[PDB]
Design an enzyme around this catalytic site. Structure first.
Site, short mmCIF file in Angstrom:
data_model
loop_
_atom_site.label_atom_id
_atom_site.label_comp_id
_atom_site.label_asym_id
_atom_site.label_seq_id
_atom_site.Cartn_x
_atom_site.Cartn_y
_atom_site.Cartn_z
N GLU A 1 0.82 -1.20 0.00
CA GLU A 1 0.00 0.00 0.00
C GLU A 1 0.86 1.26 0.00
O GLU A 1 0.80 2.06 -0.94
CB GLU A 1 -0.95 0.04 1.21
CG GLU A 1 -1.81 1.30 1.25
CD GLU A 1 -2.91 1.23 2.29
OE1 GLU A 1 -3.45 0.10 2.50
OE2 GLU A 1 -3.24 2.29 2.92
N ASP B 1 1.89 -6.79 2.43
CA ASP B 1 0.99 -6.16 3.37
C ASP B 1 1.49 -6.32 4.80
O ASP B 1 1.32 -7.38 5.41
CB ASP B 1 -0.42 -6.74 3.24
CG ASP B 1 -1.43 -5.99 4.09
OD1 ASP B 1 -1.01 -5.09 4.85
OD2 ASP B 1 -2.64 -6.29 4.00
N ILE C 1 0.61 -5.16 7.79
CA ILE C 1 -0.44 -5.53 8.72
C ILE C 1 -1.78 -5.69 8.01
O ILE C 1 -2.36 -4.72 7.54
CB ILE C 1 -0.62 -4.50 9.85
CG1 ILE C 1 0.68 -3.80 10.25
CG2 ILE C 1 -1.29 -5.13 11.05
CD1 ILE C 1 0.61 -3.15 11.62
N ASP C 2 -2.26 -6.93 7.93
CA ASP C 2 -3.62 -7.16 7.44
C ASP C 2 -4.53 -7.50 8.61
O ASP C 2 -4.34 -8.49 9.31
CB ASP C 2 -3.64 -8.27 6.40
CG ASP C 2 -4.98 -8.38 5.70
OD1 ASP C 2 -5.67 -7.35 5.57
OD2 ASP C 2 -5.36 -9.49 5.28
N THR D 1 -6.08 -4.32 10.12
CA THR D 1 -5.90 -3.01 10.72
C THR D 1 -6.86 -2.79 11.88
O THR D 1 -6.46 -2.68 13.04
CB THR D 1 -6.09 -1.90 9.67
OG1 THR D 1 -4.84 -1.70 8.99
CG2 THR D 1 -6.46 -0.59 10.34
N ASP E 1 -3.22 -7.98 -0.56
CA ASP E 1 -4.00 -8.88 0.27
C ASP E 1 -4.34 -10.17 -0.47
O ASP E 1 -4.92 -11.10 0.10
CB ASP E 1 -5.30 -8.19 0.72
CG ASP E 1 -5.03 -7.15 1.79
OD1 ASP E 1 -4.06 -7.33 2.55
OD2 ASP E 1 -5.78 -6.16 1.87
#
Lengths: 244, 244
Positions: free
Chosen positions: A53, A68, A70-71, A73, A198
């Site tokens: 991102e 990613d 941190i998936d 959030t 993701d």
């Protein structure tokens, strides 16, 4: 691509360490985790490409990381213990490996092209369920809360619910939602407006577990399409992309 | 009622290992669990009554047991690791203790009136969220699907998301959902058509944890009402309640 796969494994759980000890507390971790992974993979392979991102998801033909940090959030902030790192890797515009760590439950999800998929040592394999009526289908709300995506949201669930689905589950993590798929814990997944970091890692895994991952339309996957249908069988997958 | 509480706790745990066991294979267990608890307690306290799946939720003032051997039935058969055992206790027409044990992830939630709530020995406290717009809410489709009980699910849901709610979560375990609420990982819960044996035990834990458990309509809990709204704050319970 071992040295890289190993770099992915080693980093996914060091990040996974950073987030566990972070969860105990009562956006900083994200960056921390992001800048951890990406700075080391960077000047480990300075000429590689990345896709996290921080348009669009344009995958070249060069060795690309799709990350990613941190998936999950929101789950993090409420300390909903469904949080994850996902590191996918592509070569020749093909998805090579994926590494997805469940920080909470300490489950390393791995998947290499053609070499199978494992959660914590042992091999994974989807379900093969073909009857949607007997199926547990996964999906997620989304960040954007526009009345058009939210009506959308409610539209597809009714279709899935009027499709006569066994049960629906939304857990605040697409990465883990799909790893459930790959392992058999679920039999199908869908979602609109979800970024490809993701998607990348989970797909190789889901595939390697014997499942299928396609465009929402039923057609082939399109990284820039920001949508998915992942299933235990291409039959199941077909039923789902049809409904909706 | 010390004698009794450790009776359920030991059965929640006995049942659990059996669940974890049977889960290991590849619903006769549910009968094994049902017997497993009702049997023992029966002999132990033969003067007591039982409220379980087998009018239904008519609670007197006598010492009564409210049991669900397995919460997360559909999840069981799918191997979706969200399965729980529920043993609740009441005396004099009030909820006394509750014991809920996340079999798979091995968590024994308990709550005894006046004597706060816990999980695995750690004191639970609700989140303290009143801003519905910042809420993680949990619900469940439920049993039946007859169009009646299925377009409601979408009306409720649509309403909730309509209220600009942080997120929605359905995990396929009413008691486990409700336990999250206790723990603080969620902000509220709501469901239509959930039985008291799913709800007896949890309400005790949420209460003792500092959470509010009420009727769907905003009124107080009516165990014969097969519906619930639970939340971190009476503030929240209202914002949810006045969405429905």
């Amino acid at each position: 691509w071992e040295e890289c796969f190993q770099a992915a494994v080693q980093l996914a759980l060091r990040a996974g360490q950073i987030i566990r000890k972070a969860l105990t507390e009562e956006t900083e971790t994200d960056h921390l985790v992001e800048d951890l992974i990406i700075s080391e993979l960077r000047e480990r392979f300075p000429s590689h490409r990345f896709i996290a991102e921080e348009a669009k998801c344009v995958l070249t033909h060069s060795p690309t990381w799709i990350i990613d940090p941190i998936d999950g959030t929101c789950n993090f902030v409420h300390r909903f213990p469904t949080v994850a790192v996902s590191i996918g890797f592509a070569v020749r515009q093909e998805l090579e490996f994926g590494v997805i760590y469940h920080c909470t439950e300490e489950r390393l999800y791995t998947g290499r092209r053609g070499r199978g998929a494992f959660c914590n040592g042992q091999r994974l394999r989807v379900s093969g369920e073909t009857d949607l009526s007997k199926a547990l289908v996964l999906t997620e709300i989304g960040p954007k809360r526009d009345p058009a995506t939210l009506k959308l949201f409610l539209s597809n669930m009714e279709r899935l619910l009027h499709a006569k689905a066994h049960g629906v589950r939304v857990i605040g993590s697409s990465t883990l939602a799909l790893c459930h798929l790959a392992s058999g814990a679920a039999d199908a997944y869908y979602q609109f407006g979800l970024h490809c970091w993701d998607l990348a890692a989970a797909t190789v895994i889901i595939r390697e577990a014997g499942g299928i991952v396609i465009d929402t339309s039923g057609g082939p996957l399109d990284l820039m399409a920001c949508r998915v249908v992942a299933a235990s069988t291409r039959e199941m997958a077909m039923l789902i992309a049809q409904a909706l």
